[PDB]
């Protein structure tokens, strides 16, 4: 099939409210776990050792590189938020420190669902089925041939 350019590089899910762009490797991944124990996007970030992401324009929050309001850090593993029906993103330290109720954007290794929608089981059941090892396999081949 001819899937859109923003389809989960692992499983093909392409609902724009569900996928996240990796700014370093320049590929897309979904926020569903599929047959693994974490979401595809996080697994890739841990595997390929990346940290900066971008949401898709047609999602609820539009095209957006996640970053700290204060310092511009883009490391999603350090970022979190504090409620305003508005939300402000802040580094864990120092920007959300006492001197400068905070909660990380990644809990149980996926992005919070108001940030990135979790696809429904129906949508994940129809996606290309892939195991955790196959993902490990596939990430290792990707530096030799990213394609």
């Amino acid at each position: 099939k001819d899937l859109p350019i923003h389809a989960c590089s692992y499983c093909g899910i392409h609902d724009p409210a569900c996928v996240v762009y990796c700014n370093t490797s320049k590929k897309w991944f979904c926020n569903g776990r599929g047959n693994t124990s974490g979401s595809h996007i996080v697994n890739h970030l841990v595997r390929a050792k990346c940290k900066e992401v971008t949401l898709h324009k047609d999602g609820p929050l539009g095209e957006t590189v996640l970053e700290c309001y204060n310092c511009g850090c883009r490391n999603v593993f350090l970022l979190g938020f504090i409620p305003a029906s508005v939300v402000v993103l802040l580094c864990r330290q120092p920007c959300a420190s006492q001197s400068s109720q905070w909660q990380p954007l990644i809990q149980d290794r996926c992005f919070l669902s108001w940030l990135v929608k979790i696809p429904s089981e129906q949508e994940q059941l129809r996606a290309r089925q892939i195991t955790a090892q196959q993902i490990n396999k596939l990430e290792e081949l990707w530096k030799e041939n990213p394609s």
């Binding site: 929050l61 957006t64 970053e67 309001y69 511009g72 508005v86 939300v87 993103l89």
Partner: peptide
């Protein structure tokens, strides 16, 4: 850039 208004 760092502030998000959640969807209505």
């Amino acid at each position: 850039r760092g502030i998000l208004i959640l969807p209505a």
